Design a protein around this nucleic acid. Structure first.
Ligand SMILES: [Mg+2]
Ligand SMILES: [Mg+2]
Ligand SMILES: [Mg+2]
Ligand SMILES: [Mg+2]
Ligand SMILES: [Mg+2]
Ligand SMILES: [Mg+2]
Ligand SMILES: [Mg+2]
Ligand SMILES: [Mg+2]
Ligand SMILES: [Mg+2]
Ligand SMILES: [Mg+2]
Ligand SMILES: [Mg+2]
Ligand SMILES: [Mg+2]
Ligand SMILES: [Mg+2]
Ligand SMILES: [Mg+2]
Ligand SMILES: [Mg+2]
Ligand SMILES: [Mg+2]
Ligand SMILES: [Mg+2]
Ligand SMILES: [Mg+2]
Ligand SMILES: [Mg+2]
Ligand SMILES: [Mg+2]
Ligand SMILES: [Mg+2]
Ligand SMILES: [Mg+2]
Ligand SMILES: [Mg+2]
Ligand SMILES: [Mg+2]
Ligand SMILES: [Mg+2]
Ligand SMILES: [Mg+2]
Ligand SMILES: [Mg+2]
Ligand SMILES: [Mg+2]
Ligand SMILES: [Mg+2]
Ligand SMILES: [Mg+2]
Ligand SMILES: [Mg+2]
Ligand SMILES: [Mg+2]
Ligand SMILES: [Mg+2]
Ligand SMILES: [Mg+2]
Ligand SMILES: [Mg+2]
Ligand SMILES: [Mg+2]
Ligand SMILES: [Mg+2]
Ligand SMILES: [Mg+2]
Ligand SMILES: [Mg+2]
Ligand SMILES: [Mg+2]
Ligand SMILES: [Mg+2]
Ligand SMILES: [Mg+2]
Ligand SMILES: [Mg+2]
Ligand SMILES: [Mg+2]
Ligand SMILES: [Mg+2]
Ligand SMILES: [Mg+2]
Ligand SMILES: [Mg+2]
Ligand SMILES: [Mg+2]
Ligand SMILES: [Mg+2]
Ligand SMILES: [Mg+2]
Ligand SMILES: [Mg+2]
Ligand SMILES: [Mg+2]
Ligand SMILES: [Mg+2]
Ligand SMILES: [Mg+2]
Ligand SMILES: [Mg+2]
Ligand SMILES: [Mg+2]
Ligand SMILES: [Mg+2]
Ligand SMILES: [Mg+2]
Ligand SMILES: [Mg+2]
Ligand SMILES: [Mg+2]
Ligand SMILES: [Mg+2]
Ligand SMILES: [Mg+2]
Ligand SMILES: [Mg+2]
Lengths: 112, 63, 50, 247, 91, 77
RNA sequence: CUCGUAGCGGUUCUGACGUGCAAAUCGAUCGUCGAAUUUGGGUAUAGGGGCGAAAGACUAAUCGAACCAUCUAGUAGCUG
RNA sequence: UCUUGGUGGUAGUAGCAAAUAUUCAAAUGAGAACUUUGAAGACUGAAGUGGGGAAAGGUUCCACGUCAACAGCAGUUGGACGUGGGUUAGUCGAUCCUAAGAGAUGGGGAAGCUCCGUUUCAAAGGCCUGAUUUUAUGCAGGCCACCAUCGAAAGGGAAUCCGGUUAAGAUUCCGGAACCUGGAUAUGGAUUCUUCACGGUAACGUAACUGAAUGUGGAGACGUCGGCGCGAGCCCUGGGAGGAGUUAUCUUUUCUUCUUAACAGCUUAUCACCCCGGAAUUGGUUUAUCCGGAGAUGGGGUCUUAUGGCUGGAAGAGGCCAGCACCUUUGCUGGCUCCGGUGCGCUUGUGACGGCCCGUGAAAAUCCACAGGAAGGAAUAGUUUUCAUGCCAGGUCGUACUGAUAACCGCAGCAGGUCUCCAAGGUGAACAGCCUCUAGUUGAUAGAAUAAUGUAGAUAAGGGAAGUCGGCAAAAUAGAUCCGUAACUUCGGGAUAAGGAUUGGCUCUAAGGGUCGGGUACGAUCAACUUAGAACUGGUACGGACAAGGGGAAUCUGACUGU
């Protein structure tokens, strides 16, 4: 089989020096330098991959448009639509608790 | 020509094996093939309908 | 080293231009005692130490 | 006539702490008006592992009182503290495990950890895994409190000094045997270069006061004074009694 | 079948390290590798996560714990003692 | 190298004032029984992209080659 | 953990060689080979100091105290 | 055994013997064992004597001329000598970031050379104004609490590929095809009389779809081992379209070409998630037993695009041929370049998992998003456009070559040492040994003869350790299948204990799969190498070369792996 070479002056099998052997229109095999695989943006609350958002290297996000980077909700590209829904429930149930805890506290000190 | 003789069952005797039985063919690969066969058959018999979901779960753990 | 400094290549460039014999007309000059380049260097005989 | 290994450690060249992977300095929250007159509510967001430390670290997140921002303090996690737990630090706080209160405002026999030796030095006592501090007394005029330290000693600290309720998590760690030099190798890989240890009796006399001779023997008494210096303090330093504890 | 009479998890150590020390590690390797019952979700899904750390696989909630078991006997006492001192303070 | 799948955007593209040249390719796609036809490609030299419009029906290939502007430079083969 | 390559070491022949191929090699036979492994680069520790899983081992063929220059033409009841 | 220089005998002596190996003819030449070409024989045998690189070297690269010295023989040859030519980048690196660390400043010490310290006990400071006519944009608000700088040509990092080209350069040149960053900027589209979009129950979708201070979140960003799945490339192979080989005989045969880049659009997914529903007769399910009233199975969906498929790039290039021209400028013309299969294969990438830890396996630059609502803004398109298209620019340094049985270090053209990528067929468990393909080399003073003594390799009747300090060296054993396996033991081992049978070839037999299906008592089709058995056969050979444990009973001693 035809054998290939690293096409850059790095001769070491580092993380930034990965190759894929590919066949050219000239009929020969050649090394092709593979970029690093991208990581999905994780959730800001549960830390799971959050969907609808592109999986790009961190400077590629300045090239693509806003649709690839955000879901149409509140906390779109930040949280994961279950942590957001839990956040809306947890928001709501505490001011209704705080209002109740206010009228409980006010009434019980109004007595004695 | 030697490859066709191997297919027909020649040059495979005791004097032609240098590796162990597991080195020549790993027993795990034998198990993996044979378990995947029974699980293919069991899912084919449940989904087509010649066993119910109760006899299936008995044979799946027996397989 | 195939990825040099410029300061290394500049001294490497100087050494090649010095890597010549004596010009022959210098040996014909009046009261001339120079017979040869006494400061000739080879890559094979003397390493030039950066 | 050569400097010994116990002397060479103070130069701090190859004898430093291997501190790349550590999560930070595990301290208490800095003593302020929130923690001196009322309380402040934190939240655990991580129980992480500290490299070279046998005790987990709790990352507790507070709100800054004066600026809108979040301040992440790093605690030593108490056994029983979980993620998602509200953590209270202050004077008016409630006794739960993981709450931070002054030693004066917690009762007798309370079990505390990450206890300040002086009020506001951000945690000095009961920090290794499993250890704790018991409050054994009080002198409310000229505010002090008597404790029992993990060595068994009795200390008198200010009642304005703080502590975290509970034991430090990770206890029972040293009860497991290492079984092999490999598991000792990776314990000390992330602490410091103190391992292995060559016996001084296994040496040449130039290297150690115990080395040399036709047989491996100590030669002089291993008990040395406190009133000696470097190079002579190789053995039992300032020992009161030696050998087993059999009376 | 039943592959070993007594060594169990400690068969990886061979004949090495002594039989006392293999017995000493055996009760703690069983203790650290067991799945424990979660207190929040109720499922038996708590495993050790670098000693002192006990994350439940479901409900994603981590509990600071003992080195090899979830709760030590010593910190069990602390949960009884601090609970008593909390009531007698607010009594 | 974008691929153009429409006629009216193609004509709107050929008057873009950054395009000045184009090339037309004749391919002889002879297969067995489905379609041994005469493929015609219309490649457009935009400033940042090369636009190909493929017309496998040989009728429309005669129609489009007339309707090209005369300020554009066409390359046969 | 084990057999055993690559690797990394260096048991024995007290083999070859011993004005060598080599101021430490060559060959066979060997130890070990998924970790207290092996290794490049960066970095830190410097001479009565460092460093040492400890042999007075290693610190540029130099080590029971490196190397360079000076004091110094050091001194010699000793040999030429 | 003075110092420096010179010179002898030894002496034409010792020697020029590792790395299988050379041979014939012609050419050139004064001169050929050694040069060049052809022929032949061979070897490295893909963990290479092959293609590249890192450090180091520095011109050794390439051409012409040349052979005094050098290549321990020779020399027409050369890494030699003389003269020249040669290294092209927005995309590859450096440059930038931080690491371990190094290190100024403020300040303290020290007679002083200078030492400590890197945020300290310092009055340590730049950032945008919403947006412009009293603006060289401040003579204003407003915001920010850190605090040098150096530190990686293997870590992090914006973006380039294919084809061709040279005597020597190439991801740099040329041709074609892209992309990124920075800047400026117009048009179309989008949104707007509800002034900052609409659809979907939802997961989320789209070409767009304002968003200041401040805050928060994510990416950069991570261990190792195991098995499994998937992809690429390779290997194996069928049909066909060419070319070459063998052809006494046989051979629908043997070898060989049949390729598709970066980039772009459309599709493509295990995992994850949403809706309906409500589960014991418990179901789903992995090679590996996890999951489910905190909502399983099931039916519908949503998303990531690793990756694959189609199309553009792109057949116009590259390859293989054919015909005709035949100092033809030098080519011209024409055809083919197609469709599959297989897998415990090899190398690699990835995904979901599992195991391990008193080990839980970097940082920063950088980039994005969200929260918030500061400010500004509505006519037939006011603003704003992270939508499409259009314009301009991308500096400096490096780049040739070797990377080693001759380009580095070892006094040198030294059997030494020196970091790494790619990796064909067979045998076989195998990246072993042995043989071959591609590529490469055939270099090492030669010739003749075959004394002793050597060195390296062998064999030896009968005996079998009598040898010797001592079985030193050698021999013996060796793979695999089946049988059998003790003392003792920390119950894990001992253990391949010890021992004992079988092994070839040929012709068969028997198991062991996938895809295809039902009525509101059924077999087409393809593919793989394991295992077991049988007969027949042979100078009883058969792990036929290669490869490959000697074993047992005791004592001392250190527990062990390691140094
Ligand atoms: Mg790099
Ligand atoms: Mg195998
Ligand atoms: Mg098995
Ligand atoms: Mg320079
Ligand atoms: Mg010791
Ligand atoms: Mg000693
Ligand atoms: Mg071992
Ligand atoms: Mg071993
Ligand atoms: Mg080996
Ligand atoms: Mg030795
Ligand atoms: Mg010898
Ligand atoms: Mg010599
Ligand atoms: Mg092994
Ligand atoms: Mg190596
Ligand atoms: Mg000293
Ligand atoms: Mg000694
Ligand atoms: Mg000296
Ligand atoms: Mg003297
Ligand atoms: Mg002399
Ligand atoms: Mg002489
Ligand atoms: Mg002679
Ligand atoms: Mg001879
Ligand atoms: Mg060979
Ligand atoms: Mg060969
Ligand atoms: Mg020449
Ligand atoms: Mg010569
Ligand atoms: Mg000569
Ligand atoms: Mg040359
Ligand atoms: Mg020259
Ligand atoms: Mg770059
Ligand atoms: Mg900087
Ligand atoms: Mg820098
Ligand atoms: Mg990294
Ligand atoms: Mg090219
Ligand atoms: Mg080249
Ligand atoms: Mg170009
Ligand atoms: Mg418009
Ligand atoms: Mg719209
Ligand atoms: Mg992100
Ligand atoms: Mg490209
Ligand atoms: Mg479901
Ligand atoms: Mg690899
Ligand atoms: Mg745009
Ligand atoms: Mg170059
Ligand atoms: Mg080059
Ligand atoms: Mg090269
Ligand atoms: Mg030197
Ligand atoms: Mg030579
Ligand atoms: Mg092979
Ligand atoms: Mg095979
Ligand atoms: Mg030879
Ligand atoms: Mg005999
Ligand atoms: Mg005999
Ligand atoms: Mg005898
Ligand atoms: Mg005798
Ligand atoms: Mg022997
Ligand atoms: Mg067997
Ligand atoms: Mg046996
Ligand atoms: Mg035995
Ligand atoms: Mg030992
Ligand atoms: Mg001992
Ligand atoms: Mg003992
Ligand atoms: Mg050992």
């Amino acid at each position: 089989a035809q054998r290939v070479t690293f096409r850059r002056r790095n001769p070491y099998n580092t993380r930034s020096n990965k190759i894929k052997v590919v066949k050219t229109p000239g009929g020969i095999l050649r090394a092709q330098h593979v970029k690093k695989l991208a990581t999905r943006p994780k959730c800001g609350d549960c830390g799971s991959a959050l969907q609808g958002i592109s999986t790009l290297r961190p400077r590629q996000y300045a090239t693509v448009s806003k649709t690839h980077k955000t879901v149409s909700r509140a906390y779109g590209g930040s949280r994961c639509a279950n942590c957001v829904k839990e956040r809306i429930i947890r928001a709501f149930l505490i001011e209704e608790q705080k209002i109740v805890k206010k009228v409980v506290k006010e009434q019980t000190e109004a007595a004695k | 020509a030697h490859a066709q003789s191997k297919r027909e069952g020649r040059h495979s005797g005791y004097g032609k094996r240098k590796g162990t039985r597991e080195a020549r063919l790993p027993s795990q690969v034998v198990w993996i093939r044979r378990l995947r066969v029974l699980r293919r058959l069991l899912a084919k018999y449940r989904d087509a309908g010649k066993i119910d979901k109760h006899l299936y779960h008995v044979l799946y753990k027996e397989s | 080293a195939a990825q040099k400094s410029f300061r290394i290549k500049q001294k490497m460039a100087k050494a090649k231009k010095q890597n010549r014999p004596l010009p022959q007309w210098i040996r014909l000059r009046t009261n001339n005692t120079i017979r040869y380049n006494a400061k000739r260097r080879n890559w094979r005989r003397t390493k030039m130490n950066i | 006539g050569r400097v010994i290994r116990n002397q060479r450690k103070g130069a701090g060249s190859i004898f430093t702490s291997h501190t790349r992977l550590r999560q930070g300095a595990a301290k208490l929250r800095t003593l302020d008006y929130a923690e001196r007159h009322g309380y402040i509510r934190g939240i655990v967001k991580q129980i992480v592992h500290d490299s070279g430390r046998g005790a987990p670290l709790a990352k507790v997140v507070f709100r800054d009182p004066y600026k809108y921002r979040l301040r992440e303090e790093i605690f030593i996690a108490n056994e029983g503290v979980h993620t998602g737990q509200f953590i209270y630090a202050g004077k008016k706080a409630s006794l739960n495990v993981g709450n931070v209160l002054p030693l004066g405002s917690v009762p007798e026999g309370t079990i505390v950890s990450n206890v300040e030796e002086k009020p506001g030095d951000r945690g000095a006592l009961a920090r290794a895994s499993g250890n704790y501090v018991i409050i054994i007394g009080h002198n409310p005029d000229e505010n002090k409190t008597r404790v029992r330290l993990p060595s068994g000693a009795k200390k008198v600290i200010s009642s304005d000094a703080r502590g975290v309720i509970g034991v430090i998590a990770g206890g029972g760690r040293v009860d497991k045997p290492l079984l092999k030099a490999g598991r000792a190798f990776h314990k000390y890989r992330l602490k410091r270069n103190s391992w292995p240890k060559t016996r001084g009796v296994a040496m040449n006399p130039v290297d150690h006061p115990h080395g040399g001779g036709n047989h491996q023997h100590i030669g002089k008494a291993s008990t040395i004074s406190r009133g000696a210096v470097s190079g002579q303090k190789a053995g039992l330093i300032a020992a009161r009694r030696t050998g087993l504890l059999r009376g | 079948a039943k592959r070993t009479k007594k060594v169990g998890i400690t068969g990886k150590y061979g004949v090495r390290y002594g039989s006392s020390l293999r017995r000493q590690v055996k009760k703690l390797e069983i203790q650290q590798h067991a799945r424990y019952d979660c207190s929040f979700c109720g499922k038996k899904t708590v495993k050790r996560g670098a000693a002192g750390i006990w994350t439940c696989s479901c409900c994603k909630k981590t509990v600071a714990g003992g080195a090899y078991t979830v709760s030590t006997a010593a910190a069990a006492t602390v949960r009884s003692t601090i609970r008593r001192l909390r009531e007698m303070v607010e009594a | 190298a974008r691929e153009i799948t429409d006629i009216k955007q193609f004509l709107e593209l050929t008057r873009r004032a950054d395009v000045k040249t184009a090339t037309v390719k004749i391919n002889k796609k002879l297969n067995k029984a489905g379609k041994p036809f005469r493929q015609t490609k219309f490649k457009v030299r935009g400033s940042s992209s090369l636009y190909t419009l493929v017309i496998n029906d040989a009728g429309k290939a005669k129609k489009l080659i007339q309707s090209l502007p005369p300020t554009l430079k066409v390359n046969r083969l």
